[PDB]
Amino acid sequence: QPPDILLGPLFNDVQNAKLFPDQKTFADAVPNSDPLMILADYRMQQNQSGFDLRHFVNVNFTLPKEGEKYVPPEGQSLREHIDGLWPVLTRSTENTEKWDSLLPLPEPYVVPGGRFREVYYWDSYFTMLGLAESGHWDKVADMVANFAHEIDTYGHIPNGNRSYYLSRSQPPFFALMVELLAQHEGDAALKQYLPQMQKEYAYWMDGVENLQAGQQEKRVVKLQDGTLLNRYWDDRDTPRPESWVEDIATAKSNPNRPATEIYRDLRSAAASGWDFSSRWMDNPQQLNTLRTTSIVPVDLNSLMFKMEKILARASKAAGDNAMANQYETLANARQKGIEKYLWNDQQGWYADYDLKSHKVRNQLTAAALFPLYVNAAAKDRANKMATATKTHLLQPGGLNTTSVKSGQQWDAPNGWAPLQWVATEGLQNYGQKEVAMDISWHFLTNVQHTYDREKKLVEKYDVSTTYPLQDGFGWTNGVTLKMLDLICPKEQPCDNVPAT
Amino acid sequence: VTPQPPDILLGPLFNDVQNAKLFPDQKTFADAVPNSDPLMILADYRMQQNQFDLRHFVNVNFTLPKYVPPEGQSLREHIDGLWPVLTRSTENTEKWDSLLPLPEPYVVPGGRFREVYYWDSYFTMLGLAESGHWDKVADMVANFAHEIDTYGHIPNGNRSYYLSRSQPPFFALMVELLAQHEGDAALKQYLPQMQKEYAYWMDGVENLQAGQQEKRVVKLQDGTLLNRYWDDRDTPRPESWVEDIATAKSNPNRPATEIYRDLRSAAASGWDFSSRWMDNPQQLNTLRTTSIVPVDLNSLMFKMEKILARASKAAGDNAMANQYETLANARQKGIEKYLWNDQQGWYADYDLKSHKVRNQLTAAALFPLYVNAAAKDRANKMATATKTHLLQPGGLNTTSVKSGQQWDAPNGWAPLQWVATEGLQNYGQKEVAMDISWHFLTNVQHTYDREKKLVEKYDVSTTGTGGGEYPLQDGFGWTNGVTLKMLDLICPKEQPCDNVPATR
Ligand SMILES: OC[C@@H]1[C@@H](O)[C@H](O)[C@H]2[C@H](O)[C@@H](O[C@H]3O[C@H](CO)[C@@H](O)[C@H](O)[C@H]3O)CN21
Numbered sequence A: 001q002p003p004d005i006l007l008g009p010l011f012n013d014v015q016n017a018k019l020f021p022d023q024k025t026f027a028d029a030v031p032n033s034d035p036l037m038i039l040a041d042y043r044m045q046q047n048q049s050g051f052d053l054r055h056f057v058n059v060n061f062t063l064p065k066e067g068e069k070y071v072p073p074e075g076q077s078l079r080e081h082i083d084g085l086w087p088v089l090t091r092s093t094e095n096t097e098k099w100d101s102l103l104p105l106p107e108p109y110v111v112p113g114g115r116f117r118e119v120y121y122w123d124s125y126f127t128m129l130g131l132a133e134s135g136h137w138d139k140v141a142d143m144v145a146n147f148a149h150e151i152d153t154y155g156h157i158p159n160g161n162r163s164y165y166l167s168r169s170q171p172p173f174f175a176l177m178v179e180l181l182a183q184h185e186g187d188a189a190l191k192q193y194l195p196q197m198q199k200e201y202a203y204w205m206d207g208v209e210n211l212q213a214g215q216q217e218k219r220v221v222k223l224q225d226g227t228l229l230n231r232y233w234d235d236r237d238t239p240r241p242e243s244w245v246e247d248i249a250t251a252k253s254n255p256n257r258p259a260t261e262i263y264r265d266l267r268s269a270a271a272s273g274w275d276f277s278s279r280w281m282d283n284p285q286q287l288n289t290l291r292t293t294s295i296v297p298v299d300l301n302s303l304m305f306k307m308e309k310i311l312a313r314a315s316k317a318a319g320d321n322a323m324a325n326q327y328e329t330l331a332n333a334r335q336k337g338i339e340k341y342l343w344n345d346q347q348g349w350y351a352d353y354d355l356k357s358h359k360v361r362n363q364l365t366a367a368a369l370f371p372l373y374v375n376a377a378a379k380d381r382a383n384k385m386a387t388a389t390k391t392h393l394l395q396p397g398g399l400n401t402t403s404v405k406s407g408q409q410w411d412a413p414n415g416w417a418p419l420q421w422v423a424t425e426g427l428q429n430y431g432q433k434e435v436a437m438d439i440s441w442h443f444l445t446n447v448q449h450t451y452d453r454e455k456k457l458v459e460k461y462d463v464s465t466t467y468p469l470q471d472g473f474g475w476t477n478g479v480t481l482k483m484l485d486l487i488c489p490k491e492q493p494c495d496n497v498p499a500t
Numbered sequence B: 001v002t003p004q005p006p007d008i009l010l011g012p013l014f015n016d017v018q019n020a021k022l023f024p025d026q027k028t029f030a031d032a033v034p035n036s037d038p039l040m041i042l043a044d045y046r047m048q049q050n051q052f053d054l055r056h057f058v059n060v061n062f063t064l065p066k067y068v069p070p071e072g073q074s075l076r077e078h079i080d081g082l083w084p085v086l087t088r089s090t091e092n093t094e095k096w097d098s099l100l101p102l103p104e105p106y107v108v109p110g111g112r113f114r115e116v117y118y119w120d121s122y123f124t125m126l127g128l129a130e131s132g133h134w135d136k137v138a139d140m141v142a143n144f145a146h147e148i149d150t151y152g153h154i155p156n157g158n159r160s161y162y163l164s165r166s167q168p169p170f171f172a173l174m175v176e177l178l179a180q181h182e183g184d185a186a187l188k189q190y191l192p193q194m195q196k197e198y199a200y201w202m203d204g205v206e207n208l209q210a211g212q213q214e215k216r217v218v219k220l221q222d223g224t225l226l227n228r229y230w231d232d233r234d235t236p237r238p239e240s241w242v243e244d245i246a247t248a249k250s251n252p253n254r255p256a257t258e259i260y261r262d263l264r265s266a267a268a269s270g271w272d273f274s275s276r277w278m279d280n281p282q283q284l285n286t287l288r289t290t291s292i293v294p295v296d297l298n299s300l301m302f303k304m305e306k307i308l309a310r311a312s313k314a315a316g317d318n319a320m321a322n323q324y325e326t327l328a329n330a331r332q333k334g335i336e337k338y339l340w341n342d343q344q345g346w347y348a349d350y351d352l353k354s355h356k357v358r359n360q361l362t363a364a365a366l367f368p369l370y371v372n373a374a375a376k377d378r379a380n381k382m383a384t385a386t387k388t389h390l391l392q393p394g395g396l397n398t399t400s401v402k403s404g405q406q407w408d409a410p411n412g413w414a415p416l417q418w419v420a421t422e423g424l425q426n427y428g429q430k431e432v433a434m435d436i437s438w439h440f441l442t443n444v445q446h447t448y449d450r451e452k453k454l455v456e457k458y459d460v461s462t463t464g465t466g467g468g469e470y471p472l473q474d475g476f477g478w479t480n481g482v483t484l485k486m487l488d489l490i491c492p493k494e495q496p497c498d499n500v501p502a503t504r
């Protein structure tokens, strides 16, 4: 149960009082006794002469640790810095105290770094690429097994292993994780995790059998002509426990709209990974105008395509050819849907589909490379995507997330490792090597420059040239390894990005 | 972890079994127990579809759910003898079972209702208490406290598919019932759980802006705080799967999620279904439950606030007692202003769409008298309105609208008979209170005499029994409890009756 439900008005009071400078801190606090009895105790004590809320919290909760700082040794190469960090980013939480928001996992896992003290769904894929690249297949397998277990226990992979992340998933990479493990383990891996891949697919498509044309429900939309696509959705319609005061302030700033609708769209953008972006906003100046759930995402639907293709491949590997064909049929239908509703023929680029206006959007964002990444894109449209990339999103320090400098995280001038890799790999898929290399060199140069000065890798980079900023950093480390390998000869690998 | 509801657990397999109507009751497969991990059952299902007999597949992979009274019992004896028959003890359940474990024995309503029910349990516990079974009463209070502890609220019943909603809140009244036997020990003991339940009903209230609603709370333009019925999910009910899909399918121009939310929220109200929630009582696809502020729910919330004040005082916190008292006072004002119809002269629900008190008189209108929130003059008008519009030869009518739905004319339901009787008695309206009691009891006795059963509800217009999508069920928990209480009321304390007298 998430902390706001467990603790009631007590959670609200502590978050609003801003006892801790991060709202995630009290979301991660561990009750020392039954939260129902803490709430009862709080109600009695709170109006007592001299009641101190900070003292009450200290007495009734164990808080996250806060004073510590990682100190790398001097002058290690970029590659050695990353490679030696894996144990540091690894957590082992097979059992948790009762009432901890942290959810137990059977095997060790890598977390992104800093305040992100839990496994993240889509981060873990790019992280696992790094682990695999540097020969840590056992950690890769541990993490696949963990996610399989979450599917088994919760019915889906939560955004992270926190009670307050249970209400949503994230960009789905599990099937791609199984394929990554199969690179090492062969078809055995596809066979072992077929039931879990199927159950995750059931999650995303839940309710589709009874969904009528022109309606949406949970993570599924059916257009008027019957086309089936997915959207991001969270099952709750309240402030995020981890961003409690920010979300309340957002909704309060637009009393013309039901707060429940704003909370739903804030939580659904968090499910998208892109919390937040002009991509979801009617007005980039005002977060209270986001309408995430009314938007059909081109990246999510690309990922669904890949999931359907992988289900077909795993079915075939298990010896069920008829079932493999069924998944191929679903994949083809998805591909047609992407090509019809998620391609903007006037601009010549992929884009989201707007359910309110019943048209494909004009806005170009880095999500538009996803159809290339998953091999859904027609060849001529992949070529158009290379042009659009160079014209609009390629910047000196890497691939821009969007061309709108809104002040939000998933927008210009911010470059995010996962997006760099998806773009690089999708362009390579279609022989657009020049643009793919430009992204890799520009982003890697940006990573090296920050590492040179600060001896760290961080969650995101400003591409204009080459909560506070977080360090580690899981997906940055993974993508860097992969790109470093790409830009230097296989037989003469580099440990730092060449100056020229 | 608590299993997800059966539709989530089994993915499309559930949908397929329900739609195929392999079983004549939709509830039957909702209560099926998987013989292995549903994730693996679903994988097998998809494989076996590509290589098939659904019924046989279900037979292999699930275990499906499975009385002759003694000779010559009086009505009272039959009821007292039935308590063990209706008792279940489920401290441990199988993995993947939709049945949720409870630490103590519990009485269930009867028939297809093979689990404990929230509001039924109060009326049932009145019967248990009346006939000396205080141990069972304490068991059931403990079970509900445990559910609040474990889930954060009391679900509609102990089934995974009921977890997304509660029911008309009687827990605080159950605690007061135990307190009648134990003294205030019961209040002190269950104060934390009574507080946790209030937090559930009021969840989100601190941040709710005027003119908006969220979950179970509404805040009107002037800041007035009231509650509504709500279910956290927006899909067909597993236990009524094909019926609910048909309902939504019948108006494809309204988002199906709204219709599902309103169907589920009417089941949260206990009154699934009623003209009360519907724009047109003849058409179920017009229900709009979550836009209606219910007078019965808010009466019960008033009572909860009152008991919380009493319990707080028992625990020695007068400051907290005073706070609950202030909340109760605000609720009373809210009831008198927004849930009383002065045109008609009766309590009624408030409509959030038209921003007006509703004109319909239903049995829910007696709740303010039951909980002692009503002004004396208004209680007197309610007595007249009851006598004029709702009193029928076989008991108190649920509404005066014969819609074809269960919570409407000509159906009479035990809990509503008792609430009306007690409400009227609280304001000295003895004549109407005794009329309800004598009429309902005569109905119950007549059916008992010929059919040797008590059932879920009665025809108050014709007397006898027999809307609804499942057959009339027997037992029957709340009917038996209310019958005992009313039997005691209508005969002298010192010369009690075992059958309802044929002559007043
Ligand atoms: O690197 C961790 C996560 C990543 O998964 C996500 O795309 C990116 C996002 O900017 C942040 O999201 C996390 O934090 C939020 C609170 O700050 C949560 O509400 C959100 O659910 C969670 O994924 C940091 N990022």
Ligand SMILES: OC[C@@H]1[C@@H](O)[C@H](O)[C@H]2[C@H](O)[C@@H](O[C@H]3O[C@H](CO)[C@@H](O)[C@H](O)[C@H]3O)CN21
Pocket: B109, B113, B117, B118, B119, B120, B156, B237, B239, B240, B267, B268, B269, B270, B271, B272, B273, B406, B456, B470
């Ligand atoms: O006596 C058991 C229940 C009682 O709690 C409720 O008021 C009345 C209602 O008419 C039926 O409700 C139950 O069954 C439905 C399915 O037939 C469920 O959807 C509902 O959630 C459940 O309370 C029988 N009654």
